[PDB]
Design a binder for this molecule. Sequence first.
Ligand SMILES: Nc1ncnc2c1ncn2[C@@H]1O[C@H](COP(=O)(O)OP(=O)(O)NP(=O)(O)O)[C@@H](O)[C@H]1O
Ligand SMILES: Nc1ncnc2c1ncn2[C@@H]1O[C@H](COP(=O)(O)OP(=O)(O)O)[C@@H](O)[C@H]1O
Ligand SMILES: [Mg+2]
Lengths: 761, 116
Amino acid sequence: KKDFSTAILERKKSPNRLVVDEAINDDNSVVSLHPATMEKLQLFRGDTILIKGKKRKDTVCIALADETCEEPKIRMNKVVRSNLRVRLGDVISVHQCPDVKYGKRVHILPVDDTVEGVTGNLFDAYLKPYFLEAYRPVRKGDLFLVRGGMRSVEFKVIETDPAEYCVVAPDTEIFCEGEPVKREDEERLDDVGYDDVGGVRKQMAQIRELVELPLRHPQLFKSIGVKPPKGILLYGPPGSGKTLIARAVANETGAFFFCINGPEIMSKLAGESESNLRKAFEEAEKNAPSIIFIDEIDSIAPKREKTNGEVERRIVSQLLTLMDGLKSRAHVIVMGATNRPNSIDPALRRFGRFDREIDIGVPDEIGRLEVLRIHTKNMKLAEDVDLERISKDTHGYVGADLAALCTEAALQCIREKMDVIDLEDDSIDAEILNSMAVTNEHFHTALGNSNPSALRETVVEVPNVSWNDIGGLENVKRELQETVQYPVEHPEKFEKFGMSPSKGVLFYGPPGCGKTLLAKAIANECQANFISVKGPELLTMWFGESEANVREIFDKARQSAPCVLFFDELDSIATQRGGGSGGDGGGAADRVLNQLLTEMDGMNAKKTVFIIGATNRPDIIDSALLRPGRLDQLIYIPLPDEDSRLNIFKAALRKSPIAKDVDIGALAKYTQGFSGADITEICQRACKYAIRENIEKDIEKEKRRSENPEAMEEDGVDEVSEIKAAHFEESMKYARRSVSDADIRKYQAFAQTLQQSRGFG
Amino acid sequence: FFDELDSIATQRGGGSGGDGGGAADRVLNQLLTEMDGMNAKKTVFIIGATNRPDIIDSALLRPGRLDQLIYIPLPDEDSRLNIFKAALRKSPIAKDVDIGALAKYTQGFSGADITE
Ligand SMILES: Nc1ncnc2c1ncn2[C@@H]1O[C@H](COP(=O)(O)OP(=O)(O)NP(=O)(O)O)[C@@H](O)[C@H]1O
Ligand SMILES: Nc1ncnc2c1ncn2[C@@H]1O[C@H](COP(=O)(O)OP(=O)(O)O)[C@@H](O)[C@H]1O
Ligand SMILES: [Mg+2]
């Protein structure tokens, strides 16, 4: 087997590919190769080559060679490096140029910023001295730097004969006509490539496999027979990168594009909407391959009960009729981009039309780090930044929020330098502009002054907690591993025996004993997705998103296989159908519980979704959840004993100082009958008392310094402040037992009545 | 400061009916949902007060949320003297007023009764 999920993004091994490296020659057209490398392409020193760039761009250079280079390296010139839209570590393709084709005239114009002091035409002074009889190749739209006197001027080719690229002949005599080139083009050279997107690598691979292959190799599909899909439907949290992904793939694939907008078409007068849609479709069709993107497709096609207007129904039905007309098959690939999948009229998700749904979710930690690394470039940031901590802090953040965070940090940086800047003057010294630098405290200030946008989403990612944190419970780990990891990791044994596994595990025990910790640990070990849903969450969404929200969760369960759906706090919902209970107060559970029961029975079709429960009141739970196929197996998590308390005490103080003055073995004797929450609380209270003692010691030292500044500095500065015996002795005098003897008696009786048939031995 | 949680943070009753399902449970669920997500930031602090700790919901004492309970006791003798002088800080007082006699007099009196 192979990791084919992201294998389409791999750098394929071809003789044309070479790794981009730094260069040593300042010539605008000379590129240095390796003597053995030229043998692969049958090249020699002095020849002319074509080097491809990004977004269907390319340039033409002169192939040179040196023995200090490497085989995969190319040593691209810095100006040509900017021309090719590549950097260090990139891969570029090199081809031969049999067509030298000296051009009769080449139009070249400089940039406005570097021509300060120029009195007129720059042809004789700058163009001809380095291009007369030099036979240098030039490609349209490329930048090359030249020098004259002390003035360094960058020039861009405006026109060529042929228009692609040609060699500057001695007869290429021109004069500076017009002035279209401006410095403001610096930020608008090329909108988006492929590397300018991060965090959605899997979805980007899906889109690539769906779109780029049909648009570049229809022969394979025609041979196999299956018609490629057309309608992609990107959906996700607002401002998560949908338009960016669509524009990236469209510009990189080289196909035609037609960026339709929702309100823009809805802004047209009646009759003009249909005409504009027809013009868009016809323009796309007449220049196949084409891509039609419809931003905010939900705006022009809402749900039926919310679009009773006549013209709205007219435009919706015209869109439907045109969409069913995709039989034209001119590689027209509609890419709708909504934000809520329920908001689109379900008539747009039948066979044909939009045959796909791609969920662009909130990026994970590595995705946030990647997008921050993308945005932090092209800024005068200092060399003491720390992106890892920033990425760790930011949670519930989408790409737009981080784009705003970088701007906020820069704004704080410019605000902090206003002490010298006076707004009474209309001019500012260049030193202030050149002295700007960004530090980590600026990012902390920006983060403290910013707010996330998507904390409410049901985030899905593999958890981090491992069995090391787990405080003992080896029997439960042994059972849970063979009940969860084996049926997914090793289904071959199950299918050979032909006895299908069950997909329900239920936890019941006293509060705070490692239920959620166990669920997250088993989710992390199996490397499966984890979806935590609470009782309060469902109870609130039953009034926020009505009943359908519940189904949405299971839908999100079945679109992210393999999945571990953890229904935390089932005691609020799974209460038994009390006869005396009535009204809304007693019947609120009577809807969510029934919807859950209906969904669980249909969930048995999949073989990669595992449902885990959690309760602290095993007696009040409804019997309907104990039917086979539903959450059948009941696993009891008891109050940890002496050795388990020792293990949890060991696991609690991993980050805290040594505190070796107290043997942790004696602690378990003290804390008999304490749950895990009480042990963690005791650790936290001891740490807080240690912090208070260190704070008062520091205050005493500062007071001593203030009383006598002449007094020499002592060793009373803030130390590590290891936790001492007095800390625990004082801390454990206020604690309490979270579970009384009556509750543990109840749990023990509940276990006893469930374990009365142990007579076999 | 979420003062007077007694009206909404009580345990759900089995004798509920009619309109009672729109109050004391919906606000409780929304408050819990917001509170469990509050823990993301670092400088937001939630403090609640209740006069009926014996009937408080058990879902508002889990880790996070409102975990650390603090008992506020009725003032003692010296505390009664302190509260008497604090309340009478501004009002003019005759030179013959014996605060200690009042402190001996007002055993078992809350702060509100001393102010009254
Ligand atoms: N996943 C991402 N990777 C890289 N850049 C991103 C990502 N998500 C957002 N951005 C940046 O976000 C900036 C501005 O937000 P943008 O991505 O245009 O919002 P949007 O997701 O298109 N909004 P909408 O789809 O209308 O809700 C862009 O210029 C991107 O560089
Ligand atoms: N066996 C254990 N190993 C490690 N930590 C534990 C264990 N049991 C309890 N804890 C502590 O309990 C807390 C989690 O309690 P939890 O299981 O979520 O209670 P509940 O399931 O009732 O919400 C964690 O902070 C963790 O430190
Ligand atoms: Mg958009």
